[PDB]
Structure formats: C-alpha cells, structure tokens
Enzyme design. Structure first.
Site, PDB file in Angstrom:
ATOM      1  N   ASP A 124       0.768  -1.247   0.000  1.00 19.35           N
ATOM      2  CA  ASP A 124       0.000   0.000   0.000  1.00 19.35           C
ATOM      3  C   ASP A 124       0.802   1.303   0.000  1.00 19.35           C
ATOM      4  OD1 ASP A 124      -0.793   0.122   3.612  1.00 19.35           O
ATOM      5  OD2 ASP A 124       1.068   0.292   2.488  1.00 19.35           O
TER       6      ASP A 124
ATOM      7  N   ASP B 131      -6.676  -1.456   1.403  1.00 17.42           N
ATOM      8  CA  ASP B 131      -6.069  -1.992   2.615  1.00 17.42           C
ATOM      9  C   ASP B 131      -5.454  -3.317   2.220  1.00 17.42           C
ATOM     10  OD1 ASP B 131      -6.517  -0.095   4.608  1.00 17.42           O
ATOM     11  OD2 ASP B 131      -8.567  -0.832   4.965  1.00 17.42           O
ATOM     12  N   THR B 132      -4.132  -3.373   2.200  1.00 20.61           N
ATOM     13  CA  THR B 132      -3.427  -4.587   1.828  1.00 20.61           C
ATOM     14  C   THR B 132      -2.849  -5.270   3.060  1.00 20.61           C
ATOM     15  OG1 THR B 132      -1.333  -3.397   1.537  1.00 20.61           O
ATOM     16  CG2 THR B 132      -2.769  -3.597  -0.363  1.00 20.61           C
TER      17      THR B 132
ATOM     18  N   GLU C  26      -0.428  -6.527   5.701  1.00 17.84           N
ATOM     19  CA  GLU C  26       0.835  -5.887   6.025  1.00 17.84           C
ATOM     20  C   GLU C  26       2.017  -6.819   5.936  1.00 17.84           C
ATOM     21  OE1 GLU C  26      -0.307  -3.068   5.978  1.00 17.84           O
ATOM     22  OE2 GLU C  26       0.412  -1.680   7.516  1.00 17.84           O
TER      23      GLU C  26
END
Length: 130
Positions: free
Chosen positions: A15, A34-35, A37
């Site tokens: 992101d 929202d990817t 993490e």
C-alpha cells in the site's frame, strides 16, 4: 482530477510507494485500499510483490490526487497511482490482494469503481477471498 507524471524510486509495501514527484522524493499511500501488512500477514508478500512488479515494469507512472485531503498525518501523499494507464489501486483489489478501505476525508472519486472490482474478486474467491 488530473494525472501528473512521477518516477518510481522504491516500492515499500503493498500500500505504500516512494516516488519522485515534482522534483522531490515523497512517500505515497494508495487511496481506498487496505493490503495485508508486510511489516507479515497472509498475502502480504503477494500484495507487496504485485505492487512492486507492476510499477517497476511500467514505462510511465502517474499520480492522481483526489478532491479531499492530499496527505495523511504521517506526511504521505494520498493518491491513485497508474502504471502505463492502469490504476494500481484497482488492479490490487480486482486480483483480490486488497480490500476497499473506508473513505478518508472526502477522497472517494473511485470508491464505486473499486467496490465493483472487489465484489468480483469476492465472487471469484481470489487470494484473500480464498
């Protein structure tokens, strides 16, 4: 909204990416996504590699700010990033490597487009939707 040229410096995560914009280095956070993490969640390394490959292999990189606030509290630019005309934010969601995030400070020009891409990745049970 208008597209502006940029040059890839370094992809940091699924992101977040560092780009040269108007002559100076700057960190951008991809709008509405929202990817998983990496710093390591499930599909995090996949999302990261996806964003990196898509931008490192492009001839042209463009940034598009939305009509809301342009930077977050950490100083990162909030934008839609395009690689050879294809929006990275959209490709991530469509491939099921990111979920659509909540609209932040009036930045929602492409929320419907991304919402549609996500529903489809969901129907196809791609990656994250596995």
């Amino acid at each position: 909204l208008h597209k502006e040229p940029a040059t890839l410096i370094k992809a940091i995560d699924g992101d977040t990416v560092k780009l040269m914009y108007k002559g100076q280095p700057m960190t951008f956070r991809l709008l509405l996504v929202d990817t998983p993490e990496t710093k390591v969640e499930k599909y995090g390394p996949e999302a990261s590699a996806f964003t990196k490959k898509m931008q490192e292999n492009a001839k042209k990189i463009e940034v598009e700010f939305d009509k809301g606030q342009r930077t977050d509290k950490y100083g990162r630019g909030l934008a839609y990033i395009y690689a050879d005309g294809k929006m990275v934010n959209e490709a991530l969601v469509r491939q099921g490597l990111a979920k659509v995030a909540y609209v932040y400070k009036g930045n929602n020009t492409h929320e419907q487009l991304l919402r549609k891409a996500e529903a489809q990745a969901k129907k196809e049970k791609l990656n994250i939707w596995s």
